[PDB]
C-alpha cells in the first residue's frame, strides 16, 4: 500500500532545499537563500513563504509522494531550513527578545556537560522543533484541483487538496505549549519533552541517568520558562455559498490558524485553506480520553483571503479591455433598462431606478 520507511527519507529531502537554489515560477533565479534567510537569523523575519508550485514543476516525485503518505512528506520541509540556520551566522548582536535571554545560558551549560566521556540523555537536548524561529507557509500545488468539499469525494482527503470554505465562528487565542520542559526536584535534573498533539501528558518519571540512582520516583515540575509558544487558534468553517449544487447539507471543518494569520481573520469572510488532512494522536488526558479516540482533522498551511466574486477582498470582479467597448458604444443606456424582467413588460421608469440602486 504505502508502507515506506522513514530512515532514508531524511537523507533525500535534505538535498532538495539546501544545496540547490529553488527557481521561481517566472524562471528567475532569486537569491532568497542569501537575503531572507540572512535576516531570519537576525530576529528580523518571522514567517517565510514557500510556494509548492516550484517543486511540482521541477521534482514531481516529491509532490506525488505526499498523496501516499503525509506523516513526513509535509513537515520535513522546515527541517532542512533549520539546518542552515547555524551556518548563517555573521555578526554577533545582543539578544533583544526577552524570550531568548534565558535560552543561551542553558544551552552553553549542556556543552560543558556532554564532554567525551559521559553523555547525558538525548531527551534533554533541543532537536529541530525548539531551535527553529520561523513558520513556513505552503500554498496550493498541482496535486489536487482546488474545489469545494461537496464535489470532492470523501476518499480524496488525506492528500493535498484546497478547501475554499467560509469561516463561521472562531474562539479565543491561547498559546499552545510546544516543548513541555520538566524539572526533577529529587536530584536536580531537567527533562525536555516536545509534544505536538493538543492534549498534554502529565509525566512524572524522569528518564535520566541521575534519577535511576534514587529508585524512588522523580517529581517533575512543569516549567513554563525555557520553552517555545505558538499562537494557536480554533475555529469552525462551512462550505462556500456560491459553490453548492441543487440541495445539499452543511458540513463543518476544523482549520488551525498559526503564525501571522492569527488575530486577523474574522468570522464572515471567505478564505481558501490548503494543506493536508491527517488524524491526531490523543494520548495524555486521563479523564476525557477513555480508550483511543483517534479523531481526524485538517491541518492548514496557508490561508488566502477571498470574498464573493474573485479570489480577493473586493465586492465584485473586473474584466479585460476588449469587453469594455461593447458596453460603452451607446449614447447613454438603452439595452440595460430592457434587460430587467425580460418576461414581462410595463413601467419602464421603475426599472430605470433599479439600476441606479447599488451606486449610492
Amino acid at each position: 500500500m504505502a508502507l515506506k520507511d522513514y530512515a532514508l527519507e531524511k537523507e533525500k529531502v535534505k538535498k532538495f532545499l539546501q544545496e540547490f537554489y529553488q527557481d521561481d515560477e517566472l524562471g528567475k533565479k532569486q537569491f532568497k537563500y542569501g537575503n531572507q534567510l540572512v535576516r531570519l537569523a537576525h530576529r528580523e523575519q518571522v514567517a517565510l513563504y514557500v510556494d509548492l508550485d516550484d517543486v511540482a514543476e521541477d521534482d514531481p516525485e516529491l509532490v506525488d509522494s505526499i498523496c501516499e503518505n503525509a506523516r513526513r512528506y509535509a513537515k520535513l520541509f522546515a527541517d532542512a531550513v533549520q539546518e542552515l540556520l547555524p551556518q548563517y551566522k555573521e555578526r554577533e548582536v545582543v539578544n533583544k527578545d526577552v524570550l531568548d535571554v534565558y535560552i543561551e545560558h542553558r544551552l552553553m551549560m549542556e556543552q560543558r556537560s556532554r564532554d567525551p566521556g559521559m553523555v547525558r540523555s538525548p531527551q534533554n537536548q533541543y532537536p529541530a522543533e525548539l531551535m527553529r524561529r520561523f513558520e513556513l507557509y505552503f500554498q496550493g500545488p498541482s496535486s489536487n484541483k482546488p474545489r469545494v468539499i461537496r464535489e470532492v469525494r470523501a476518499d480524496s482527503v488525506g492528500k493535498l487538496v484546497t478547501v475554499r470554505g467560509i469561516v463561521t465562528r472562531v474562539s479565543e487565542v491561547k498559546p499552545k505549549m510546544v516543548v513541555a520542559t520538566y524539572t526533577c526536584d529529587q536530584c536536580g535534573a531537567e527533562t525536555y519533552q516536545p509534544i505536538q498533539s493538543p492534549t498534554f501528558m502529565p509525566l512524572i518519571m524522569c528518564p535520566s541517568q541521575e534519577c535511576q540512582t534514587n529508585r524512588s520516583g522523580g517529581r517533575l515540575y512543569l516549567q513554563t520558562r525555557g520553552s517555545r509558544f505558538i499562537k494557536f487558534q480554533e475555529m469552525k468553517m462551512q462550505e462556500h455559498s456560491d459553490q453548492v449544487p441543487v440541495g445539499n447539507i452543511p458540513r463543518s471543518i476544523t482549520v488551525l490558524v498559526e503564525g501571522e494569520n492569527t488575530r486577523i481573520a474574522q468570522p464572515g469572510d471567505h478564505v481558501s485553506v490548503t494543506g493536508i488532512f491527517l488524524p491526531i494522536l490523543r494520548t495524555g488526558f486521563r479523564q476525557v480520553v477513555q480508550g483511543l479516540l483517534s479523531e481526524t482533522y485538517l491541518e492548514a498551511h496557508r490561508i488566502v483571503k477571498m470574498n464573493k466574486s474573485e479570489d480577493d477582498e473586493s465586492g465584485a470582479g473586473e474584466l479585460t479591455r476588449e469587453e469594455l467597448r461593447q458596453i460603452a458604444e451607446e449614447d447613454f443606456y438603452e439595452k440595460l433598462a430592457a434587460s430587467i424582467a425580460p418576461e414581462i413588460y410595463g413601467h419602464e421608469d421603475v426599472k430605470k431606478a433599479l439600476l441606479l440602486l447599488l451606486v449610492g
Binding site: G315, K335, G346, V350, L357, G360
Partner: protein, 120 residues
Amino acid sequence: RCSILAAANPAYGRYNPRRSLEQNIQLPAALLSRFDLLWLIQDRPDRDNDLRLAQHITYVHQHSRQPPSQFEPLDMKLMRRYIAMCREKQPMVPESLADYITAAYVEMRREAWASKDATY
C-alpha cells in the same frame, strides 16, 4: 450598508381612492418620506397595454429569452462588472451648478404644501 428594496402592498390590492394617501398604506409617517422614490403599480382599463402583455408571453413558449423585437438580452458579467469600476469615483459638484439644486428644492415644496394628503 444595505440598499432597501421594499415591496409593500396596499390595503385593497389595486389603487382604489378610499381615503387619504397617508392612511392608504399601513405604515407610519417616519418611513413614508424616508425613501427617495415612491413608485406605485396600478391597473387601468386600457386595451393598448393589455395587447402587449398577451404578445411577449406568446414568444416564451418558443424562445427562453427576449422575444424577437428590437432589444437583446445580456449575460451576467456585464452590467455588474462595469458598475463596480465606478464605485471609487467621487463626483464633485461645482459651485455654479450647486445653486440650481438649491433653487429646485424650493419649487419642490410647492406640490407638498398645497396637498397635505400626500407625502410631505
